[PDB]
């Protein structure tokens, strides 16, 4: 996020970090339940990757996070690598996340729902804050 | 780097697809929703994270960070996968596994 601001630790409890086998963040995700994480198809997540829940300051030596293993990756079959259309993958976790103060789910909208243009919304992440 | 240690946040406006095509043209498909162009930009490493709007007191997933300006330009809207358009597949999938 360019021109964002540091969130309060634990204020976005559904936010997870998808890390490779060697511990490097490569994409974000959201817990929608204790056993499933939704992310983008383009992130090309594998069962080798790990989901870090409850994290705030990645630069830590530790805080009370959870490293969850991925049992199966469900990439949308309509995902089009060319147009980046239908860009969603679901991750089924090997072991369920333990909900707490700092780890809980985001709600899913109904397909019928409308979010009007002009509405202020929020985005979160550990992306670069400068290009 | 420019790659933060601490989680960052930003609030930003949703755009209509019609206004979003004013920036991205035909690259904008039914399953995408745009937001931003307001002085903030999602950038490298934010991909797959949430775009949430309050819905009855509760934060709801409206978009997933997908793509944006190759320079992380704060005057161009970011593009998010439109959850409302993919939620039947989400539910069908959960129900089957």
């Amino acid at each position: 996020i360019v021109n964002g601001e540091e969130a309060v630790p634990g204020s976005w409890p559904w936010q997870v970090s998808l890390q490779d086998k060697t511990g490097f963040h490569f994409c974000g995700g959201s817990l929608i339940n204790e056993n499933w994480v939704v992310t983008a198809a383009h992130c090309g997540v594998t069962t080798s990757d790990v989901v870090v829940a409850g994290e705030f300051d990645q630069g830590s030596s530790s805080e009370k996070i959870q490293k969850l293993k991925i049992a199966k990756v469900f990439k949308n079959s309509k995902y089009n690598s060319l147009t980046i259309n239908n860009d969603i993958t679901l991750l089924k976790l090997s072991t369920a996340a333990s909900f707490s103060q700092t780890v809980s789910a985001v709600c899913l909208p109904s397909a019928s729902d409308d979010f009007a243009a002009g509405t202020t919304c929020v985005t979160t992440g550990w992306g670069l804050t400068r290009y | 780097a420019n790659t933060p240690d601490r989680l960052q946040q930003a609030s930003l406006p949703l755009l209509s697809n019609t206004n979003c095509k004013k920036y991205w043209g035909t690259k904008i498909k039914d399953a995408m929703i745009c937001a931003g162009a307001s002085g903030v930009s999602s950038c490298m490493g934010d991909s797959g994270g949430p775009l949430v709007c309050k819905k009855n007191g509760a934060w709801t997933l409206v978009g997933i960070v997908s793509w944006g300006s190759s320079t992380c330009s704060t005057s161009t809207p970011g593009v998010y996968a439109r959850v409302t358009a993919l939620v039947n597949w989400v539910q069908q999938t959960l129900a089957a596994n």
């Binding site: 969130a7 634990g10 204020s11 409890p13 789910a105 985001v106 899913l108 | 509760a58 934060w59």
Partner: peptide, 10 residues
């Protein structure tokens, strides 16, 4: 879902 125990400050 969607109500953090820790409230965000935006």
């Amino acid at each position: 879902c969607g109500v953090p125990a820790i409230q965000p400050v935006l």
